[PDB]
Amino acid sequence: SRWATPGHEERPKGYFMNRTPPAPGQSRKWEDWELPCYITSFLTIVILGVGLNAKPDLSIETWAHQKALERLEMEKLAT
Amino acid sequence: VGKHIVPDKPLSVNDELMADTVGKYEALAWLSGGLGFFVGLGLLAVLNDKASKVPFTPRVYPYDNLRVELGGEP
Amino acid sequence: KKMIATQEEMSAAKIALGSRDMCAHLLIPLNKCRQAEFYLPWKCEDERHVYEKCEYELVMERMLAMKKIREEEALAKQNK
Amino acid sequence: GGGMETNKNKFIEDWGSARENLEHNFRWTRRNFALIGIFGIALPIIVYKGIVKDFHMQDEDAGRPHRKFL
Amino acid sequence: MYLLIVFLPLLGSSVAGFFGRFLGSEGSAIMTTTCVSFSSILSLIAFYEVALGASACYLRIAPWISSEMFDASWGFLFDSLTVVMLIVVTFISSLVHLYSISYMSEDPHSPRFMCYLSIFTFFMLMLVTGDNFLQLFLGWEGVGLASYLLIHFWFTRLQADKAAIKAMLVNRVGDFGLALGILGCFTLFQTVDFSTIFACASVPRNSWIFCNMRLNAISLICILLFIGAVGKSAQIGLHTWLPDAMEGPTPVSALIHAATMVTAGVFMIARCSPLFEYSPTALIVITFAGAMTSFLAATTGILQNDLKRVIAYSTCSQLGYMIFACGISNYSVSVFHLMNHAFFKALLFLSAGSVIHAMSDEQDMRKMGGLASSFPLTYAMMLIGSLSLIGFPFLTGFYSKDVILELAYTKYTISGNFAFWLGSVSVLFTSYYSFRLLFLTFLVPTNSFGRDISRCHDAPIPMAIPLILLALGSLFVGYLAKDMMIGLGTNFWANSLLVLPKNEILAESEFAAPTIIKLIPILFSTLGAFVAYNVNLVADQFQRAFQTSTFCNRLYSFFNKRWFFDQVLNDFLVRSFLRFGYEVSFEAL
Amino acid sequence: GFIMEFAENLVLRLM
Amino acid sequence: DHLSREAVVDRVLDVVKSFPKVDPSKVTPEVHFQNDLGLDSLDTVEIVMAIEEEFKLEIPDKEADKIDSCSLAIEYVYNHPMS
Amino acid sequence: GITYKGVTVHTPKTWHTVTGKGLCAVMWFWILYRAKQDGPVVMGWRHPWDG
Amino acid sequence: PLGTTGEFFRRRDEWRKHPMLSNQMRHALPGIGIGVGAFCVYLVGEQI
Amino acid sequence: MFPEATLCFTPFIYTLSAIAIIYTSLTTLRQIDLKKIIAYSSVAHMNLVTIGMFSLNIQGIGGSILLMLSHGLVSSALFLCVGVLYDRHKTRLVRYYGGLVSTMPNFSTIFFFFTLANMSLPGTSSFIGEFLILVGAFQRNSLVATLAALGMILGAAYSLWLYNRVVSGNLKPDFLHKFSDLNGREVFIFIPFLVGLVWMGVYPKVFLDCMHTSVSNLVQHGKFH
Amino acid sequence: GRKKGLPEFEESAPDGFDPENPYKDPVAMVEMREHIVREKWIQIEKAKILREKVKWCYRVEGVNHYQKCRHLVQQYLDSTRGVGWGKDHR
Amino acid sequence: AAYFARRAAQKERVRILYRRALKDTLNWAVHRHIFYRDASDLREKFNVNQDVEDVDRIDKLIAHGEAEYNKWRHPDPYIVPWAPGGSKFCRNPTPPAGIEIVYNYGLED
Amino acid sequence: GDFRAKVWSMTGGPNCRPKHWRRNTAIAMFGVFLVCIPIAKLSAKLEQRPHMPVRPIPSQIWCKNFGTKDDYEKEH
Ligand SMILES: CCCCCCCCCCCC(=O)SCCNC(=O)CCNC(=O)[C@H](O)C(C)(C)COP(=O)(O)O
């Protein structure tokens, strides 16, 4: 019967982040910190996710890897 | 669950942290005897010298005991 | 009992190093059949029997060899 | 009944405040002398001698003289 | 498809954990069971592809920790050993999820439980599939964490919290050992990659300075790794957490502490055999430890009164047989026995869970009895599991246990002799406690409460299905897989396991052993069954001694209280550190 | 045009 | 479900009726054991242990020593939620 | 179920009894068949290649 | 159950003589009959 | 600046740091104040950092820097958790709390995550630095690495004990009976800490790639071979 | 602004450094330190390339790896002795 | 009075000692039929001394009987699963009463 | 119990019986399948099979990395 008869919780128990819902038809009023923090978070995501994948790879490992390949080639082909 | 006891006497210094019929050093002695059983069995196996009564010669692989196949000089 | 399987054949058949003994020329067909038959135990019965007889004979020869050495340990003891 | 603040228990607070003021109880006893001598002086010296020897054993394993320290 | 195997249980756990409020018990039961079952199906396909098809799979996602030579990566390795462990883990996990659907049906918090089961499954998969030591360490710690979370699932119970903390701390002592071993591996080889290390392991001969001592580097590394194995497989040093882990719900005991996670040490020794083969000293240490553990757990289990306790001490003894099989250089046999134990021990834990559920959560065998007719199916499942465990001829446990005992007999060394003796006597002890459990639970005149008998019921279908499948496995899997895994000269393992020629003893064990040696397991098992029958049915005064003799009473206590191992450790070690923390470090300094 | 090529050029400008 | 006072009364009086010294004619739900039934207080301890087995309860030793009558045992068993 | 002086014992489900009987019967038959097929080999009377 | 105490406790245990709670050793080897009969039929069949 | 003195004093630094890790971890074990437990934990972590940096190789210095950053995230988050508890209940004594999982499950989950991070659980940011420092130390001195790896056992002990005494068990309504889980501001505050911990834990390459040249030149400074 | 492409450095050790007295040309001393660091990274990258060969020979050759990987194993283990800043000095 | 209370306190000690000895007799016997004889024998120990009138001797016998219980006590006694120390104890307890959950805490206003 | 009905959790708390749990379960299953598609594609791209299988296998349909590591001397 637990699989054929629907549950009884019309609405869940508790309120997400313990805030009571707004009056019917109304919207929750945003606290003053919300918009600046959300815009900062969006800009952080955009800046890191684009600039980190867009900046040139200048790591010493990458430069030395290409240098190592060509030295093993120059020494293998020649004797 | 039922009703947590609320202290009515001064707590001791070591109360944050506070095996019934055997003693402490007695339990240590019984456990030491138990481990001495294993020690005695090991010494008995030494005295047995089972390695000296093996009923077959050691195996001998071909190709110089698989010298090259085991990473030796070709 | 002389070695029949060459090194090349044993490497091509990918024999575990510990099964590169005098009986490997029979292990090769047995492992081919075992792979073809999904290693079912009621399968490959002739190949397996032949290979196991070979291995048993190897062990028996090493047992007789050890029987000879152990009867010279006594010779040394009774002559000392 | 009223408030999220915890209802203080006098013995629990006495225990906590006694924990916060232990330095007023130190008395330079025989037990304290032994505990400070063993754990405050001897054991650090033993650990230091262990670390140094480890380097010296590496030094002699590499065919090198003992590295001077401190 | 190979990534799906690893990450499907993670997806299921994530949906049950983050969105369980939208699915409830039923949704979360379905979501988690489906995802693990699909992973199990893909695991079977991978077994067909990799082991039967002889086509290993290698998958590298990204670097994890790259610092100069240090090369830990998110990489997956699928060879024969890997797919064998995959089948074991995914199949047992699917069955346990299905069983839990009905076993936890009245529990208030089933979605969290299912999420924890799935996260454990994911971490175990990460463990067995890693291609380097660091991913393996991640799996090691993850299964430790999931085990801790499941042991104290009933968070209000003080016994469960203590048991979970104890399990985490013992496992951390092993993880210490394992991490030191990994550091040594990197220092010697300049890598943590399994393939590179195994390709190089035969070359190094250098000595190392470890704690002001000059030791062989390979031997030091192998012993340090074995310390982590000792932790995870509850061997002699670090064994006491396993019996207390019974505080968790029965499905956790079946899946985590009997089939998959408790065997991680055996798996790691088998996977690192190309390294362990060049440390004879470490192999001797392993041989001794496994043997001692089998005897310890066997002697402790014969006086336990709780069903789950008896079955946990059984697991510990069986893990000892598997460790010394590895120590005598027979890894294929140890992995075969691991796969075989995962069927019978899971059948035994789930059957015991069915009995406990039917008896209103009574777990004491002294308040049971006369239950064979009331629970026919459960009694039959327990019989089959017990017969397979004791090594009854031609059942699943018969094909690996006696081969290990014959191989120990054939190891003509001091530690080989030690292991042969201890395993032989442990066979008698395990037969005794298995038949004692059967007799006390089902066959003696009933010692139970009327209110328990009058409220009994056998397994609901989501519980009986896994029991049937595990009974079939415990009957046929041994015979069916024997030639593939340990058949003379088999190539099934390919390059996953390494036995050096000088250590090969399987032919001499099948051919040079006196016929008697092969029968001592049946003879000891028969004697143990007979002694159990006499003690638990025709003894009316072999209990006066424990009430009138001081020496017999202390021995009864010695063995019932696990050799006083927990008492001694807590009294001399845990209390010592706890007292230092307040009296020296804080108050004197 | 493409986001990333512009982003490449902008990052190069800033360096 | 809970057990009805009646069921408790019946099964407690059945337990007391099985005692050999007790004659199964003067056991009411209000008889006292050392006054009406002619029993020593060790017999009372045995009867309390029998009631304990009969309902699967674990009475604390302080409370078990207080039960000295059929009525006392009846009220303890019906008020216990796990009977 | 059958009630005997207070205690009532419920008869098990028929398919449960049948499944237990049949799986054990299968196990007993499997043991007998395996013993006949490869018991002289474990006893050591003969060898698998004998013939 | 000779003493008054043991006699009382044996009297209370009368329900333990329940028909299907007792003599359970006869139920210890379920299918031993069907399995043996099937083996016999198979053996006879193998004769032909 | 003083590579020769740095070499001469290396055993001294190793000894001081190893003593600090063991003794301070054991003192942590016996603390009864939330903030006192989190504060003592930082002493053990920073002395591990010193062992790493005085190992004078890539693993050591890289791990020291990574653990510095990871500690800066993790200890800050832990202080934030304790502050969430103190703002409501105004007590730091562990004995008053207990059973909070049943009234503050969101706080309990976040607190558990940062508790795991403080134990250097693989997958978290602190494990990367911890293990890289152990790698760096082992290559120089196996004893110091062995004493420093004891932290894995002691830090687990106190972290799990704290978490289970605060969150697990039953409520004690005679001390606390009124509760509130995290509001939106507190959840948002925790989000970047979680993201950073996981990000460094699973893909520390973004950080290590920007640091290797500087770390390498620091390691080489004073020598020319 | 920076041009697109991989970083460029001088192939050669700086002319102006005296190994006898390295604290004599400070600019040359700094340049020599950076050059040595770059050279050390080239040796690390060489040992990493040789490790990929061993990894794949083990994987491809299976049980024949002992005889097939022998030269690659020797090369890798020789490159790893005195690599970077680990357990070997120069 | 005082001699009545002092004799009454002794009676309680004997009744509780007997209860615990009897429950432990079942832990060591397991089967019902062995319990019958063991319980009969324990009851005979108490009955032999049932008729003593000297009060100091009663105290000495009580102390001896408690010491005997504490030595020959079964190491792993049976406990009903929901009783304290039981396997089911404090599993899924009913929540305590008097718990309030507050909404809209920590607002900027 | 009584107060737990006012306590919000992600896993739903005790005895969670959402009214639309079937439709929610179906939506979760569709989400897991959609998430699994890219994982399967990436796995097929990343798999490396140095050895041809003895018989044809399902991975040969989607994975084209069979017998590619033969020249391990050129690995980098
Ligand atoms: C495994 C455990 C070991 C076994 C433990 C062995 C215990 C020792 C057995 C003997 C102990 C004693 O003599 S214990 C003391 C002996 N008895 C006395 O106190 C004097 C008698 N007077 C009385 O008060 C009552 O007759 C009384 C009998 C109490 C009835 O109480 P009621 O007036 O309420 O019916």
Numbering used by the authors:
A (entry chain g): 30 to 108
B (entry chain l): 37 to 54, 70 to 125
C (entry chain o): 8 to 87
D (entry chain m): 2 to 71
E (entry chain L): 1 to 589
F (entry chain i): 2 to 16
G (entry chain T): 39 to 121
H (entry chain j): 9 to 59
From the paper:
Protein complexes of the mitochondrial respiratory chain assemble into respiratory supercomplexes. Here we present the high-resolution electron cryo-microscopy structure of the Arabidopsis respiratory supercomplex consisting of complex I and a complex III dimer, with a total of 68 protein subunits and numerous bound cofactors. A complex I-ferredoxin, subunit B14.7 and P9, a newly defined subunit of plant complex I, mediate supercomplex formation. We propose that the main role of the plant supercomplex is to stabilize its components in the membrane.
One is located at the tip of the membrane arm at ND5. This half-channel has also been seen in complex I from mammals and Yarrowia lipolytica.
